[PDB]
Amino acid sequence: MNTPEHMTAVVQRYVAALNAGDLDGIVALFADDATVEDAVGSEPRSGTAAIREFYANSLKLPLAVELTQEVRAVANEAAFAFIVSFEYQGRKTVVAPIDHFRFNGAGKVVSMRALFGEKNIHAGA
Amino acid sequence: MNTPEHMTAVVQRYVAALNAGDLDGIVALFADDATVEDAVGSEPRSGTAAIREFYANSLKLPLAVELTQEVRAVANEAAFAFIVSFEYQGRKTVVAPIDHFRFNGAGKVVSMRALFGEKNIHAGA
């Protein structure tokens, strides 16, 4: 089935995969017809190909991501607070969002939504 | 309109109202036909009366609640990590969930969902 332990584990695999730039590891977490909403408001990408392409572009730069709090998992859902750090042109940026995963009975992620705004983007000059 | 600043402010008012046991202050944040999903999975209470009753029972005990991280506000949505502490029969409990608010154009909350599980309930013996 799908348990809080399993959802928490998936969140951790997700986080470790972004760190390793393990694209197959990330997509394998999703259902074939899942949706990924990179930033709320935007049009949710659908399907394995779309999902993989999104993460592929998100990995152009080396990312350092970690959970900053315990994962919240309950009845087919999980939400977590974390940070995604990267550096560009001598500038270090740290995006602090909160993600939400919706699982199916198979334990696969059918829906992922990343929530963050300008105030959650911490960068120097 | 509805802005990240306004949504963040509503989250802070929400948190301060629970602390003050200000029931009118909390309900006033919601749209008349809003829904509150106390714990994911359960049936979402609907309408002012239902919403107020839920918070009324949640305030039977004195609650100490605070944000533990920055609020995430983007396009009609906000999510936040926080703690709700209370004491009973000499036992101190701290529930650490992540909430999600959906706003309308008026800046009112039309949907609130609290996400947390047993692993997010920290209590001693």
Ligand SMILES: C[C@]12CCc3c(ccc4cc(O)ccc34)[C@@H]1CCC2=O
């Ligand atoms: C796209 C991005 C890399 C990945 C990423 C960002 C923000 C939120 C995320 C949420 C995720 O669940 C997975 C990856 C990201 C960054 C915004 C700036 C940047 O370089």
Ligand SMILES: C[C@]12CCc3c(ccc4cc(O)ccc34)[C@@H]1CCC2=O
């Ligand atoms: C009901 C409760 C008081 C309020 C409350 C809890 C958990 C999550 C919440 C999320 C909210 O957005 C507002 C109030 C609560 C506690 C669980 C144990 C308890 O006494």
